[PDB]
Design a protein around this ligand. Structure first.
Ligand SMILES: OC[C@H]1O[C@H](O[C@H]2[C@H](O)[C@@H](O)[C@@H](O)O[C@@H]2CO)[C@H](O)[C@@H](O)[C@@H]1O
Ligand SMILES: OC[C@H]1O[C@H](O[C@H]2[C@H](O)[C@@H](O)[C@@H](O)O[C@@H]2CO)[C@H](O)[C@@H](O)[C@@H]1O
Ligand SMILES: [Zn+2]
Ligand SMILES: [Zn+2]
Ligand SMILES: [Zn+2]
Ligand SMILES: [Zn+2]
Ligand SMILES: [Zn+2]
Ligand SMILES: [Zn+2]
Ligand SMILES: [Zn+2]
Ligand SMILES: [Zn+2]
Ligand SMILES: [Zn+2]
Ligand SMILES: [Zn+2]
Ligand SMILES: [Zn+2]
Ligand SMILES: [Zn+2]
Ligand SMILES: [Zn+2]
Ligand SMILES: [Zn+2]
Ligand SMILES: [Zn+2]
Ligand SMILES: [Zn+2]
Ligand SMILES: [Zn+2]
Ligand SMILES: [Zn+2]
Ligand SMILES: [Zn+2]
Ligand SMILES: [Zn+2]
Lengths: 371, 371
């Protein structure tokens, strides 16, 4: 299983508009004769570094920009070469997210942030605070509904609450991240995680809730709210739930702070098709018609391409996404991010079960993240 | 020992221009017949709450604004009553420092921040970084000079270094301080204190250095630098040392962050002379001629009175003071500040001696500050 010259294989996560991307691929193939294959492997963010290290894997890998620093450090990504005219077509802050050691290591596609999604038929006025959700849940629970269900298995989803009162990954300083200053066991993080664990131990939420269960619950009107990204909107559209996308609730009077991801496309350093990959990404995908094809499948969020974003920006769901993004922080792209996510994922799982105390769980995560 | 009606007794710290203040007092006495006594007791910030609690003490107490929240909470201070025309004469941010629970509890006099003071004859180009001071000290040490001497006994002086990399007292949030989020044992504080302790353990500085020794050393040219406030300048003037006042050095590429104090004048709630005290403070002291009398004795810093500050602002020493102030933080005035200072004072003393480790010292301070 190697990489053939003269074809493109693209990996993208299963929650994104891979069929729409495949349509852009088929258009490229029709115009050029170059076959484009789109796959969505499980755990692609882990599989890529394993297969790319041996010189194999996809020609193009899509993921949020946070994983890309580590890929690039491991020599798995090729420096990309858009010209000044091309770079001008995307927002500068999107290029920042994909710059690593003064080198662009991927094409930015779209800016993603979690929002609060609520059922307007159940909940005309969404809660402004996390604090009021317990009582709302009790009130709803007959009705026979619940207030809030979202993916508790991945720290991406729980982090906005953890960060609200002060939790953080790595301290941003002299333009760089102090990788020895990790903010996962400070009082803010502890306050956030404690509230979350309390909701679970009091059966306002279930520790086993994952993406699939929460999506089912919201999309069939069993729960009044969920937390998710723009990729989720099209299934809600199909469900016919009358939904709103809004600012996340506050905690201790402060904004929830989602970690902002820029979906990005990197080129496998081991690919003999670097020129083709550049041509596809710049002149097929990163175009109004190309982004529209993907977006129509699953919404991308706020696209990096100025010309198309100017249209999407009029959508109140996009406005809410960017409001939530502004209240959160851009993810760092440093290689240490992988250890951070792993550390936080374990801490949340362990605390939610009652296995470890919040304090003990976060103490452990702090140590793991920082070494 | 009680408080007589028809006289004013003022307490002010011994490092301030108490003789100049006494001159303003004698002017008031000449105009009105009201005797004004100025004293500078030792540990006046501790003695005041002890004596004022029993209904005794000075009619007017001067200290930086940080102690005043606790005084006011204990019912020891009278709400002051300047009118809108008077309030307009001082800078709004100075009034903020003396507001406690929506009530003004003192008259602001001047804004104080520490600066780096250096001997231009020994050291034409002052170090920009804390990191370069060890090597400079070795180079100077014959010569037979030292690089830096400043008061190590009081945390006021060591805090700017401790805060540089992230240390903090109480987290500022919804306009209020989260009194359960104390930042004295995070990685930044630990990094700061560790560097300080290293300088001491390596004999670049002496753990026993206090205000008096450091002032002697600088003012007689034995050390190239000191850290101090504007009140110190007049003795340096007299010493004839060719000195500069400049931005504090950075640590880990970040500004030293001095805690900014607003010298303030409160009225003892137990005083039968509240009207007289108001009259003296508003119409004698807080005037160009009144502040000038004090300033001429020992410089006040950047005065709260707009009209006089517009003159003082042209002094590069004042510019440097305000540059350092802008890089630091205004002290909170909450009652918890007293526990904070006590906690940090002990931690620094204990670590500097080698009694406790930096980690153990700050762990202990963290607990004490937050309870
Ligand atoms: O949960 C940790 C996880 O968070 C992010 O993954 C997101 C991704 O950015 C979104 O595009 C969407 O697919 O949901 C994912 C969460 O399941 C980080 O990008 C990822 O590295 C990290 O492991
Ligand atoms: O060292 C802790 C101490 O710091 C401040 O005291 C300063 C004061 O603000 C200055 O005016 C000058 O007099 O030096 C003092 C340090 O010795 C706080 O105001 C004080 O409450 C605190 O104890
Ligand atoms: Zn193959
Ligand atoms: Zn297809
Ligand atoms: Zn799949
Ligand atoms: Zn071009
Ligand atoms: Zn409850
Ligand atoms: Zn740092
Ligand atoms: Zn169901
Ligand atoms: Zn259904
Ligand atoms: Zn169904
Ligand atoms: Zn921010
Ligand atoms: Zn008396
Ligand atoms: Zn006198
Ligand atoms: Zn005295
Ligand atoms: Zn008036
Ligand atoms: Zn040394
Ligand atoms: Zn807080
Ligand atoms: Zn001497
Ligand atoms: Zn001398
Ligand atoms: Zn002498
Ligand atoms: Zn600041």
């Amino acid at each position: 299983m190697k990489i053939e010259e003269g074809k493109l294989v693209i990996w993208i996560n299963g929650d994104k508009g891979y069929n729409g991307l495949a349509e852009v691929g088929k258009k490229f193939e029709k115009d050029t004769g170059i076959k484009v294959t789109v796959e969505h492997p499980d755990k692609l963010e882990e599989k890529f570094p394993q297969v790319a290290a041996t010189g194999d894997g996809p020609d193009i890998i899509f993921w949020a920009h946070d994983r890309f620093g580590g890929y690039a450090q491991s020599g798995l990504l090729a420096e990309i070469t858009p010209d000044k005219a091309f770079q001008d077509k995307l927002y500068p802050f999107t290029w920042d997210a994909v710059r690593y050691n003064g080198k662009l290591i991927a094409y930015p596609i779209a800016v993603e942030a979690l929002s609060l999604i609520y059922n307007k038929d159940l909940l005309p006025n969404p809660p402004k605070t996390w604090e009021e959700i317990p009582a709302l849940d009790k009130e709803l629970k007959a009705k026979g509904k619940s207030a809030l269900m979202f993916n508790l298995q991945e720290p991406y989803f729980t982090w906005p609450l953890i960060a609200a009162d002060g939790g953080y990954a790595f301290k941003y300083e002299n333009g760089k991240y102090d990788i020895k200053d990790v903010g996962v066991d400070n009082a803010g993080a502890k306050a956030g995680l404690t509230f979350l664990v309390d909701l679970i131990k009091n059966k306002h939420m279930n520790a086993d809730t994952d993406y699939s269960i929460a999506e089912h619950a919201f999309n069939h009107g069993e729960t009044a709210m969920t937390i998710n990204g723009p990729w989720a909107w099209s299934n809600i559209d199909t469900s016919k739930v009358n939904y709103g996308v809004t600012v996340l609730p506050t905690f201790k009077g402060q904004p929830s702070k989602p970690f902002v991801g820029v979906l990005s496309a990197g080129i496998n350093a081991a690919s003999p098709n670097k020129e083709l990959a550049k041509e596809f990404l710049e002149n097929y995908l990163l175009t109004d018609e190309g982004l529209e094809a993907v977006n129509k499948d699953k919404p991308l969020g706020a696209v990096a391409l100025k010309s198309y974003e100017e249209e999407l920006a009029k959508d109140p769901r996009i406005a809410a996404t960017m409001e939530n993004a502004q209240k959160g922080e851009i993810m760092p792209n440093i290689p240490q991010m992988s250890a951070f996510w792993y550390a936080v994922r374990t801490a949340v799982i362990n605390a939610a079960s009652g296995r470890q105390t919040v304090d003990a769980a976060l103490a452990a995560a702090q140590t793991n993240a920082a070494a």
